[PDB]
């Protein structure tokens, strides 16, 4: 025999950031359709209008308390461009140290505190119970206990990462230390010692616990490398400038779609709204001409997330996207465990192959590998920084200007565009990471990246449909970012 | 606390928040967040961290709420948007019925022992209620009052609050309740709230009057660039003079920095944040 249709709605999707409803159509044990709804709106793009442009680098951080340094960074880059501010070299490096520390925080938070319960049974008390009666928790008693022990240790490690952010960022969430013109606090020798001491502890945890546990848990869920492919299409806009030219970055830009690498041209971004709660006349706009006119009663729409498309393509973003586009060498422990636990011989990230990389478990692997990769970048910046050297310039506010800041938030590509008129914000448009991942259909009916990645996900037990949200969580969504 | 001790039930509902008030709590040093969750409270519903999901998570909260009617603590993070019949914030769906933040506060608000409005958005409206917004973002206390809901509210503001203000206010309340019972205990908490509903142990002192750069302010020695750490930050936009918080002493993130040392205070705990504290970078 076989089974017919069951339609399953999950609201709230938990162990993500923000407000998401997912609805899937299951036929014969697999998802055959999906709709994702961002169910909360604030409207930062209209709140920002009329303000002193410098206020943006504080206001925008409140889009998302998990990734505020990403919004800080995109905003100050946009303001730097609009103001003609020339960030001193030492300020560029200080910014990289502030922001890079939150990559470590965010990926560790994501794997352990958001994702790991997908595979690990926590202690027998809230918030770890109750849960699905058949949660498909496959780990041995010993390995499950390692997961719990590491979850608990990771609470301290992620906190230490925020201490690293705050050393030159002031506090976290919501840094004070990035402004137009650079960074507000010159690193001292003494505080660089404090950053390095914390960094060593984080490094040890990443190398010894986090990267190994992802491959080890993955080896008990090998079926999870065979689903979640979606479009197999990715975007990277570049991040972490490595010199003052604006042309060299830790993550270099690129698009990948239909098996082909292509350059990134931001003029090909358009945001569609047919299936989003925004006025119909605002559909199809590039961000330099973007408009944000809510329409919460518009028939047929199902999300406050706009639908960004790149030259018509629906793309995903995040660690997988960046690691696929840039194809770095894999970590030593990843190479070893791919051989020992999977029989896979691999040297660089693409040696996983397109199918396994673009998968539910591949996205967790990519995020762990990227965390390891960031260690080397931060170590480099700690050698490059010059204690005592100025990190900021103080530029006058222009009467009329525009600028765009591009970076990679922990969850994927982020840009902020600002237009200044009469010395105030005339328009401010944000195109964020979880916008690229968790958006609804476009005006042609083409699904968003996660919607498409849900197709084919197995649901062999409609009463315990655990793989639907497991797939969603692999993308590390934050709906605050997606909607703003 | 102990793993086997008395731990009251807590539901954490997110309206128009950024999750920063959850993240800041995760940064608590002592007690650690692990100890808070396993030894101090029973966090029965929290969408960012809980095991279950969807209608099952909502129904779990409803079952606990029935068992502990009048006795659970309700944490609200984010503002409550009232425009468009609540559609700017849907928090869940159960029995094919969407649950707006408006609906959720009308359902659980009346049955809580107390509502802890965590963060400036929940306490005062904050950025979602600021100029240029259009969702009807409303503060918790105003929403509850407008709807005839008398449950006590304690505001723990900041954008985000310091973890110590959140955990410390919980500890304040749990101590008062241990000594006096629930109604007598909450009466003792209300007695130590300022006119903006904030606990005076954390919000009873002014930043500027306790600031290490106060001598420079009085001398008129003002930094002209952020990286000059000798002068006062007033000309760079510091709002310490108008701000009631203890950041000058407890500082942030394990004591490693704070806003005035690093840059400027933006007045994030104040009821008029952000508009009455803006522009941030001039006096
Ligand atoms: S204006 Fe700010 S930096 Fe200056 S003394 Fe007051 S609180 Fe301190
Ligand atoms: S110093 Fe000012 S801006 Fe910083 S946390 Fe304290 S009150 Fe908020
Ligand atoms: N990381 C992060 Fe936030 C999201 N999604 C942004 O951009
Ligand atoms: Cl970030
Ligand atoms: Fe946007
Ligand atoms: Ni985010
Ligand atoms: S995020």
Q: Assign 3-class secondary structure to A160-172.
A: HHHHHHHHHHCCC
Inspect the interface and report whether the beta carbons of B44 and A170 lie closer than 8 Å.
no
What is the residue whose two structure tokens read 């950041």? B247
Distances (CA, A) of A279 to A140, A284, A443, B246: 52, 11, 13, 45
Q: Which residues contact A234 (CB under 8 A, 6 or more apart)?
A: A255, A256, A257, A315, A316, A317, A320, A321, A324, A325, A358
| B23/A474 Cα distance (integer angstroms) | 20
Asked if residue A180 lies in contact with residue A80, where contact means CB atoms within 8 angstroms, the answer is yes
Burial classification of residue A280, based on how many CB atoms lie within 10 Å of its CB (0-12 exposed, 13-18 middle, 19 or more buried) = middle
Pairing assessment for the beta strands B97-100 and B90-94 based on DSSP bridges = antiparallel
Chain A stretch 129-148, residues whose beta carbon is closer than 8 A to a beta carbon of chain B: 129-132
Distance spanning both ends of chain B, measured CA to CA = 46
| B156/A83 Cα distance (integer angstroms) | 37
For residue B159 the two structure tokens come to 């954008």
| A239/A249 Cα distance (integer angstroms) | 6
Pairing assessment for the beta strands B72-77 and B112-118 based on DSSP bridges = parallel
- B204 Cα to the center of ligand 2, angstroms: 14
* Contact pairs from chain A to chain B, CB under 8 Å: 265
CATH number for position B195: 3.40.50.700
Burial classification of residue A240, based on how many CB atoms lie within 10 Å of its CB (0-12 exposed, 13-18 middle, 19 or more buried) = buried
Distances (CA, A) of B251 to A117, A166, A430, B163, B217: 33, 10, 32, 11, 20
| A167/B255 Cα distance (integer angstroms) | 9
Asked if residue B261 lies in contact with residue A424, where contact means CB atoms within 8 angstroms, the answer is no
Asked if residue B91 lies in contact with residue B131, where contact means CB atoms within 8 angstroms, the answer is no
For residues B153 and B190, membership in a common domain is answered with: yes
CB half-sphere exposure, A25, CA atoms < 13 A: 8
| A88/A94 Cα distance (integer angstroms) | 10
CB half-sphere exposure, B146, CA atoms < 13 A: 11
For residues B40 and B180, membership in a common domain is answered with: yes
Distances (CA, A) of A481 to A38, A179, A305, A446, B183: 10, 20, 9, 22, 40
For residues B90 and B220, membership in a common domain is answered with: no
Nearest to B234 by CA among B250, B216, B252: B216
Q: How many other C-beta atoms lie within 10 A of the C-beta of residue A142?
A: 8
Please identify, among B177, B202, B227, the residue that sits at the C-terminal boundary of a domain: B202
Ligand 2 touching residue B211 (CB < 6 A): no
* Helix, strand, coil percentages for chain B (3-state, nearest 5): 40, 20, 40
Query: Which residue ranges have their beta carbon within 6 Å of ligand 7?
Result: A 17, 64, 66-67, 411, 478, 481
Inspect the interface and report whether the beta carbons of B48 and A14 lie closer than 8 Å.
yes
Alpha helical stretches, state H, A206-318: 211-220
Nearest to A358 by CA among A450, A232, A181: A232
For residues B26 and B128, membership in a common domain is answered with: yes
Contacts of B58 in chain A (CB under 8 A): 12
What is the residue whose two structure tokens read 């569609």? A272
* B39 part of contact set with chain A, CB < 8 Å: no
Q: How many other C-beta atoms lie within 10 A of the C-beta of residue B150?
A: 9
Searching chain A, which residue's CA lies closest to the CA of residue B274?
A: A59
For residue B133 the two structure tokens come to 């917004």
Q: How many other C-beta atoms lie within 10 A of the C-beta of residue A138?
A: 12
Searching chain A, which residue's CA lies closest to the CA of residue B40?
A: A126
Alpha helical stretches, state H, chain B: 20-26, 33-35, 54-67, 101-108, 119-124, 140-146, 163-191, 200-203, 214-219, 247-250, 259-262
For residue A473 the two structure tokens come to 């969580």
Chain B stretch 174-213, residues whose beta carbon is closer than 8 A to a beta carbon of chain A: none
Pairing assessment for the beta strands A254-257 and B97-100 based on DSSP bridges = unpaired
Searching chain A, which residue's CA lies closest to the CA of residue B133?
A: A47
> What is the Cα Rg of chain B in Å?
20
Distances (CA, A) of A180 to A90, A247, A392, B224: 14, 19, 8, 15
What is the residue whose two structure tokens read 């050393």? A167
Ligand 3 touching residue A90 (CB < 6 A): no
For residue A202 the two structure tokens come to 């984080």
| A119/A231 Cα distance (integer angstroms) | 25
Pairing assessment for the beta strands B42-45 and B9-14 based on DSSP bridges = parallel
Residues with CB under 5 A from ligand 6 (ion): A 64, 66-67, 478, 481
For residue B55 the two structure tokens come to 């209608």
| B219/B206 Cα distance (integer angstroms) | 19
The angle subtended at Cα A38 by Cα A441 and Cα A322, nearest 5°, is 70
Beta partners for residue A425, in sequence order: A420
Residue A271 counted as an annotated binding residue: yes
Distances (CA, A) of A335 to A211, A225, A332, A343: 11, 17, 5, 10
- A377 Cα to the center of ligand 4, angstroms: 16
Asked if residue A420 lies in contact with residue A398, where contact means CB atoms within 8 angstroms, the answer is yes
What is the residue whose two structure tokens read 């591009």? A406
| A461/A450 Cα distance (integer angstroms) | 21
| B263/B204 Cα distance (integer angstroms) | 23
- A167 Cα to the center of ligand 2, angstroms: 15
Nearest CA to ligand 1 atom 6: B208
Please identify, among B202, B217, B245, the residue that sits at the C-terminal boundary of a domain: B202
What is the residue whose two structure tokens read 């409005």? B117
Inspect the interface and report whether the beta carbons of A51 and B18 lie closer than 8 Å.
no
For residues B265 and B143, membership in a common domain is answered with: no
* B16 part of contact set with chain A, CB < 8 Å: yes
| A388/B118 Cα distance (integer angstroms) | 38
What is the residue whose two structure tokens read 């520390």? A101
Contacts of B8 in chain A (CB under 8 A): none
Q: How many other C-beta atoms lie within 10 A of the C-beta of residue B3?
A: 10
- A408 Cα to the center of ligand 3, angstroms: 8
The angle subtended at Cα A57 by Cα A51 and Cα A62, nearest 5°, is 95
Inspect the interface and report whether the beta carbons of A64 and B18 lie closer than 8 Å.
yes
> What is the Cα Rg of chain A in Å?
22
Contacts of A47 in chain B (CB under 8 A): 127-128, 130-133
Inspect the interface and report whether the beta carbons of A47 and B50 lie closer than 8 Å.
no
DSSP for A128-163 reads: S-S--TT------HHHHHHHHHHHHHHHHHHHHHHH
What is the residue whose two structure tokens read 């649950």? B99
CB half-sphere exposure, A9, CA atoms < 13 A: 12
For residues B181 and B222, membership in a common domain is answered with: no
| B219/A83 Cα distance (integer angstroms) | 32
Burial classification of residue A388, based on how many CB atoms lie within 10 Å of its CB (0-12 exposed, 13-18 middle, 19 or more buried) = exposed
What is the residue whose two structure tokens read 């629906």? A314
Q: How many other C-beta atoms lie within 10 A of the C-beta of residue A1?
A: 3
Distance spanning both ends of chain A, measured CA to CA = 46
Asked if residue B249 lies in contact with residue B260, where contact means CB atoms within 8 angstroms, the answer is no
| A104/A110 Cα distance (integer angstroms) | 10
| B178/A115 Cα distance (integer angstroms) | 37
DSSP for A341-405 reads: HH----SBGGGG-HHHHSSHHHHHHHHHHHHHHHHHHHHHHHHH--TT---B--PPPPSSEEEEE
Query: Which is it for the CA torsion B94, B98, B103, B109, positive or negative?
Result: positive
Q: Among all residues of B, which ones are annotated catalytic?
A: 18, 21, 121, 159, 208, 211, 232, 238, 247, 259, 265, 268
Q: Is the peptide bond before A125 cis (omega within 30 degrees of 0)?
A: no
For residue A229 the two structure tokens come to 């492919």
CATH number for position B226: 4.10.480.10
| A180/A83 Cα distance (integer angstroms) | 8
Q: Which residues contact B197 (CB under 8 A, 6 or more apart)?
A: B117, B123, B141, B153, B154, B155
- Interaxial angle between packed helices A89-108 and A68-83, expressed in degrees from 0 to 180 and rounded to the nearest 10: 160
Asked if residue B262 lies in contact with residue B229, where contact means CB atoms within 8 angstroms, the answer is no
Q: Which domain holds residue B158?
A: 1-202
Query: Which is it for the CA torsion A415, A416, A419, A423, positive or negative?
Result: negative
Query: Which residue ranges have their beta carbon within 6 Å of ligand 1?
Result: B 207-208, 211, 213-214, 217, 232-234, 238, 240-241, 260, 265
| A78/A58 Cα distance (integer angstroms) | 13
The secondary structure element, H or E, covering residue A47 is helix A44-47
Contacts of A19 in chain B (CB under 8 A): 14, 89-91
For residues B47 and B177, membership in a common domain is answered with: yes
DSSP for B41-106 reads: -EEEE-TTT-S--HHHHHHHHHHHHHHTTTTEEEEEESBEE-GGGGTTBEEEEETTEEEEHHHHHH
Burial classification of residue A152, based on how many CB atoms lie within 10 Å of its CB (0-12 exposed, 13-18 middle, 19 or more buried) = middle
* A193 part of contact set with chain B, CB < 8 Å: no
Inspect the interface and report whether the beta carbons of B281 and A55 lie closer than 8 Å.
yes
Q: How many other C-beta atoms lie within 10 A of the C-beta of residue B261?
A: 20
| A426/A53 Cα distance (integer angstroms) | 9
For residues B101 and B42, membership in a common domain is answered with: yes
Nearest to A31 by CA among A467, A477, A470: A467
Nearest CA to ligand 2 atom 2: B265
| B114/B41 Cα distance (integer angstroms) | 14
Q: Is the peptide bond before B160 cis (omega within 30 degrees of 0)?
A: yes
DSSP secondary structure letter of residue B281:
T
Asked if residue A333 lies in contact with residue A211, where contact means CB atoms within 8 angstroms, the answer is yes
* A266 part of contact set with chain B, CB < 8 Å: no
For residues B162 and B216, membership in a common domain is answered with: no
Number of domains in chain B: 2
Distances (CA, A) of B138 to A22, A102, A264, B112: 27, 31, 41, 19
Q: Which residues of B are annotated as a binding site?
A: 18, 21, 77, 120-121, 159, 208, 211, 232, 238, 247, 259, 265, 268
For residues B7 and B25, membership in a common domain is answered with: yes
Buried b (16+ CB within 10 A) or exposed e, A421-454: eeebbbbbbbbbbbbbbbbbbbbeebbbbbbbbb
Q: How many other C-beta atoms lie within 10 A of the C-beta of residue A342?
A: 16
Residue in A14, A19, A62 nearest the CB of B50:
A14
Inspect the interface and report whether the beta carbons of A174 and B252 lie closer than 8 Å.
no
Question: What are all long-range contacts of A375-380, with beta carbons under 8 Å and residues at least 24 apart?
Answer: A375/A104, A375/A202, A375/A203, A375/A206, A375/A207, A377/A96, A377/A100, A377/A240, A377/A250, A378/A96, A378/A97, A378/A100, A378/A101, A378/A104, A378/A199, A379/A199
Beta partners for residue A427, in sequence order: A419
Residues with CB under 5 A from ligand 5 (ion): A 430
Cα of B265 to nearest chain A Cα, Å: 8
Inspect the interface and report whether the beta carbons of A170 and B130 lie closer than 8 Å.
no
| A123/A150 Cα distance (integer angstroms) | 13
Residue A174: strand, helix, or coil: coil
| B82/A2 Cα distance (integer angstroms) | 46
Please identify, among B202, B237, B260, the residue that sits at the C-terminal boundary of a domain: B202
The secondary structure element, H or E, covering residue A412 is strand A412-421
| A209/A156 Cα distance (integer angstroms) | 13
Which domains, ranges and CATH numbers included, belong to chain A?
1-484 (1.10.645.10)
| A59/A54 Cα distance (integer angstroms) | 9
Inspect the interface and report whether the beta carbons of B56 and A132 lie closer than 8 Å.
yes
| A285/A40 Cα distance (integer angstroms) | 22
Buried b (16+ CB within 10 A) or exposed e, A190-215: ebbeebeebbeebbebbbebbbbbbb
For residues B97 and B213, membership in a common domain is answered with: no
Ligand 2 touching residue B264 (CB < 6 A): no
Contacts of A277 in chain B (CB under 8 A): 87
Cα of A1 to nearest chain B Cα, Å: 30
Cα of A178 to nearest chain B Cα, Å: 9
Residue B181: strand, helix, or coil: helix
- A83 Cα to the center of ligand 6, angstroms: 26
Phi/psi class of residue B216: alpha, beta or left (left: φ > 0; alpha: ψ in -120 to 50)?
Answer: alpha
Nearest to A19 by CA among B98, B168, B162: B98
Pairing assessment for the beta strands A30-38 and B112-118 based on DSSP bridges = unpaired
The resolution in angstroms reads 1.1
| A418/A287 Cα distance (integer angstroms) | 10
Nearest to A440 by CA among A426, A455, A452, A458: A452
For residue A187 the two structure tokens come to 């690193």
For residues B46 and B152, membership in a common domain is answered with: yes
DSSP secondary structure letter of residue A209:
I
Residue A425: strand, helix, or coil: strand
């Amino acid at each position: 025999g076989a089974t017919g249709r069951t339609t399953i709605a999950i609201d709230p999707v938990t162990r993500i950031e923000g407000h998401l409803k997912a609805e899937v159509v299951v036929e014969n044990g697999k998802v055959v359709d999906a709709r994702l709804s961002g169910t909360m709106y604030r409207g930062f793009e209209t709140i920002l209008r009329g303000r002193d442009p410098r206020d943006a680098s504080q206001i925008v951080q409140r889009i998302c308390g998990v990734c505020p340094t990403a919004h800080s960074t995109a905003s100050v880059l946009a303001l730097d461009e609009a103001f003609g501010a020339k960030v001193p070299n030492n300020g560029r490096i200080t910014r990289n140290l502030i922001f890079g520390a939150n990559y470590l925080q965010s990926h560790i938070l994501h794997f352990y505190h958001l994702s790991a319960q997908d595979f690990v049974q926590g202690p027998d008390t809230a918030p770890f119970v109750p849960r699905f009666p058949k949660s498909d928790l496959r780990l041995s008693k010993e390995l499950n206990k390692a997961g719990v022990d590491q979850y608990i240790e990771a609470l301290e490690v992620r906190r230490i990462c925020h201490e690293m952010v705050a050393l030159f960022g002031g506090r976290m969430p919501h840094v004070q230390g990035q402004v137009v013109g650079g960074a507000t606090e010159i690193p001292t020798k003494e505080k660089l010692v404090e950053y390095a001491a914390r960094f060593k502890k984080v490094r040890d945890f990443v190398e010894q616990k986090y990267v190994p546990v992802v491959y080890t848990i993955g080896s008990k869920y090998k079926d999870m490398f065979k689903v979640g492919q979606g479009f197999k299409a990715a975007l990277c806009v570049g991040a972490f400038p490595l010199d003052n030219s604006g042309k060299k970055h830790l993550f270099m830009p690129g698009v990948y779609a239909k098996g082909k690498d292509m350059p990134f041209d931001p003029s090909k971004i358009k945001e569609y709204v047919k299936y989003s709660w925004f006025a119909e006349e605002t559909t199809g706009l590039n961000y330099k001409e973007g408009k944000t006119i809510p329409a919460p009663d518009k028939a047929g729409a199902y999300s406050f997330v706009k639908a960004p498309r790149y030259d018509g393509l629906s793309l995903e973003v995040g660690p997988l996207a960046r690691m696929w586009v840039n194809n770095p060498e894999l970590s030593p422990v990843g190479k070893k465990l791919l051989k020992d636990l999977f029989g896979i011989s691999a040297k660089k990230f693409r040696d996983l192959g397109e199918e396994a990389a673009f998968s539910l478990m591949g996205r967790h692997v990519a995020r762990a590998e990227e965390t390891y990769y960031m260690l080397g970048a931060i170590e480099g910046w700690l050698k490059e920084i010059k204690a005592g050297e100025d990190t900021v310039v103080m530029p006058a506010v222009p009467a009329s200007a525009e600028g765009t800041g591009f970076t990679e938030a922990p969850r994927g590509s982020l840009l902020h565009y600002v237009k200044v008129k009469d010395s105030k914000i005339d328009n401010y448009q944000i195109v964020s990471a979880s916008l690229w991942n968790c958006n609804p259909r476009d005006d042609m009916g083409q699904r968003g990246a996660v919607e498409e990645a849900l197709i084919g996900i197995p649901v062999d037990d409609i009463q315990n449909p655990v793989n639907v949200a497991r797939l969603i969580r692999a993308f590390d969504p934050x709906l605050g970012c997606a909607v703003h | 606390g102990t793993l086997t001790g008395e731990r009251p039930p807590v539901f954490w509902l997110q309206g128009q928040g950024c999750t920063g008030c959850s993240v800041t709590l995760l940064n608590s040093v002592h007690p650690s967040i692990a100890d808070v969750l396993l030894k101090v409270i029973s966090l029965e519903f929290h969408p960012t961290v809980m095991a279950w999901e969807g209608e099952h998570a909502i129904e779990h909260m409803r079952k606990v709420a029935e068992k502990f009617k009048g006795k659970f603590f309700l944490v609200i993070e984010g503002s409550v948007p009232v425009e468009a019949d609540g559609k700017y914030c849907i928090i869940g769906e159960a029995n094919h019925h969407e649950i707006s933040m408006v609906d959720a506060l009308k359902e659980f608000g009346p049955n809580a022992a107390a509502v802890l409005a965590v963060g400036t958005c929940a306490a005062y409206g904050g950025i979602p209620a600021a100029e240029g917004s259009e969702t009807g973002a409303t503060a918790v206390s105003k929403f509850l009052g407008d709807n005839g809901i008398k449950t006590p509210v304690v505001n723990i503001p900041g954008c985000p609050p310091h973890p110590d203000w959140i955990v410390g206010t919980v500890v304040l309340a749990l101590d008062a309740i241990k000594k006096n019972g629930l109604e007598g205990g909450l009466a003792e908490v209300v007695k130590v709230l300022d006119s903006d509903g904030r606990p005076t142990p954390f919000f009873g002192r002014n930043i500027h009057e306790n600031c290490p750069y106060l001598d420079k302010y009085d001398e008129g020695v003002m930094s002209a660039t952020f990286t000059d750490k000798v002068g006062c930050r007033y000309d760079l936009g510091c709002k310490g003079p108008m701000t009631m918080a203890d950041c000058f002493e407890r500082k942030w993130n394990g004591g490693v920095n704070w806003c005035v040392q690093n840059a400027v205070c933006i007045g994030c705990v104040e009821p008029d944040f952000p508009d009455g504290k803006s522009p941030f970078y001039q006096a």
